[PDB]
Symmetry: C2
Subunit: 386 residues, 2 copies
């Protein structure tokens, strides 16, 4: 059998760029919990002993930006200078242009309102896992989530919040469909305390992290493991390693599979097409595959500022479609409402009080079963069987 | 003929995120001009009346970070609050951890040194344009470059630095190769002064910008034009619109085509595999197509921190290869040196004094003919003809 190697990575919730995504979305969630119509463009950056929140917010909400920063950092585990940031003592620069909504005198609706910006977004799905995501991405991501889990539940209390994971999968191409054969290489680089030995780290990573996450059918005697290959990782988080919102957009989506239109998600209210548009095209690609039309699907949408209807839509099934891609395009266009105001309503994205967006801001926006991930709910599609 | 629509965008050099990429790379260039061995991880952010440079630099160079910020902003055209940032008067926060190199007492080499980080990178090429780039990306990008050109040479002196462009191309798929048929939709949203009328903007955009850039063979009576569709754009740049380094990574690469591994380029010295690795795989994909092995090619490489050899390589020719992809993979692996220390040397990336990286930081890292873009020089590949 002819195979090829495809790699995806993940970063842990303590990585300084991901920290910024989480802070940005914790701010967004706080705004929406009080004011579903909040306009939010909240950017975060961080470096040694400092977090700055910036950007623009128009809201009726009363939000303690500094407290959200500190609470978000503390819950991730940044409780001291030694672990890479002291949530209680670090500098927090609050640099947001805060506005209340416009006051106007006079006597646009979701059906007619134009996009708030131009741009393009892609959705992807593949039948190679039950959540219709690429296995290389799923496994890298799940290793990261597992590192967080065993640190917070005390199973591996030697762990610290920062770290990275990476999985190389050996694939076969079946008529355009991606068929995972085996895991070729697993890499973990995790932050840890100054007492645990290299031997304890390697044994615990194998037994508490890799073994539970990676199906045994994909592991064999030849699988390569790189476990903290560069040696010690005691220093982490923002300490000596600046972070910014929107610097993990491939980890947030499909891990190199599919495509990306460039726009980050975190800190953006769900009227913004970079977020709602990307979520709708995930729902569309996932629905094409789940309804049986194809084994794999890529969907693009694009917008112009001030225009409600998309400028373009395509569908590509990588030759796996059971009906022509032009027919799948017609069905997608008829079944999905790509108008900006309508996307936000149909995915129930303004609904407050469930911490929805902070949940998205680590360990991927796609492939998760939580009911707040409304874009993961398949839409039933009618299709003229071949 | 069966066609589909594919969209790519661009932003102008005055867009606040792109401003940050340019500042970050102007800092990098200044470091390398004096000290080719500089370690640079320079991040920039901006908001109304402020730029902050941050991150980490180890260098022997003496660099006036604030002066580089102001010079970079001024040359782009940010000369007043009215045009979106006053380069001479705005706040510049210098927040870099500056170090000199380690002082050590004792009696690694490029061949043996490990990658500085993990991650994966993709290269792409396509025979649909002479520079072996996707037409949707090339045209969006060239419209942006043209807007800058006619503003700076006074042809359209009403222009201001910020703006965005977007092109939808109608394509045909010929045996996996992408064949552009026509331009379906052109969008331009440009910043401008308070005197020019909407009619003058639309006429000058058509005649001075669109007509010279887009080959007439791709334009017809049905092509849709959206010219400043949301109305006036007098306010721009950082004014009310926060920017950050590394938020335009799809514009920096392939416009939705190919793939992306996630890592930004700007502000990173060329020992960093996110930059050198991505540049080498562009050279490899371009070389596969230019040597006649394929019409289209995608190449991935991946790395582990502390390991010199890549963890994985793949090649995909989208069924356009004239020899099997496994044979093209063998040729690429034999012909290219993917070791981090060697990539930097073979692409001559430390060479100082030519403003190389600032040139990359607007209007795309790929598809340009300038001799400093060493990764655009095709390597001759020997291949066992079919
Ligand atoms: Cl403070
Ligand atoms: Cl308002
Ligand atoms: Cl509108
Ligand atoms: Cl928007
Ligand atoms: Cl300790
Ligand atoms: Cl360390
Ligand atoms: Cl369309
Ligand atoms: Cl819908
Ligand atoms: Cl200042
Ligand atoms: Cl040093
Ligand atoms: Cl090394
Ligand atoms: Cl690196
Ligand atoms: Cl004016
Ligand atoms: Cl305006
Ligand atoms: Cl390989
Ligand atoms: Cl080489
Ligand atoms: Mg308070
Ligand atoms: Mg980073
Ligand atoms: Mg000075
Ligand atoms: Mg932005």
């Amino acid at each position: 059998m002819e195979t090829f190697l495809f790699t995806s990575e993940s970063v842990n919730e303590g990585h300084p760029d991901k920290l910024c995504d989480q802070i940005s979305d914790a701010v967004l969630d706080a705004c929406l919990e009080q004011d579903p119509d909040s306009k939010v463009a909240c950017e975060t950056c961080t470096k040694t002993n400092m977090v700055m929140v910036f950007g623009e917010i128009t809201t009726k909400a009363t939000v303690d930006y500094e407290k959200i920063v500190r609470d978000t950092c503390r819950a991730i585990g940044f409780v001291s200078d030694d672990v890479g940031l002291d949530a209680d003592k670090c500098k927090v620069l609050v640099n947001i242009e805060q506005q209340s909504p416009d006051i106007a005198q006079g006597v646009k609706c979701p059906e007619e309102i134009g996009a708030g910006d131009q741009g393009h977004m892609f959705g992807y799905a593949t039948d190679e896992t039950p959540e219709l995501m690429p296995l290389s991405h799923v496994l890298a991501t799940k290793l990261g989530a597992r590192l967080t889990e065993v640190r917070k539940n005390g199973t591996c209390a030697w762990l610290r919040p920062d770290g990275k994971t990476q999985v190389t999968v050996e694939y076969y191409n079946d008529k355009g469909a991606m068929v995972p054969i085996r895991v070729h290489t697993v890499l973990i680089s995790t932050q840890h305390d100054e007492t645990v030995t290299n031997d304890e780290i390697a044994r615990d990573l194998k037994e508490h992290v890799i073994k539970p996450v990676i199906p045994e059918k994909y592991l064999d005697e030849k699988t390569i493991f790189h476990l903290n290959p560069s040696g010690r990782f005691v220093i982490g988080g923002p300490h000596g390693d600046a972070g910014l919102t929107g610097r993990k957009i491939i980890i947030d989506t499909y891990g190199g599979w599919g495509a990306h239109g460039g726009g980050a998600f975190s800190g953006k209210d769900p009227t913004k097409v970079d977020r709602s548009g990307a979520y709708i095209v995930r729902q569309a690609a996932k629905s094409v595959v789940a309804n049986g039309m194809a084994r794999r699907a890529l969907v693009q949408v694009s917008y112009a500022i001030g225009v409600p209807e998309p400028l373009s839509v395509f569908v590509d099934t990588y030759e796996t479609g059971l009906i022509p891609d032009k027919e799948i395009l017609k069905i997608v266009k008829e079944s999905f409402d790509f108008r900006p105001g309508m996307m936000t309503i149909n995915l129930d994205l303004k609904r407050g009080g469930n911490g929805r967006f902070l949940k998205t801001a680590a360990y991927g926006h796609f492939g998760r079963d939580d009911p707040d991930f409304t874009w993961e709910v398949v839409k039933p599609l009618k299709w003229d069987k071949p």
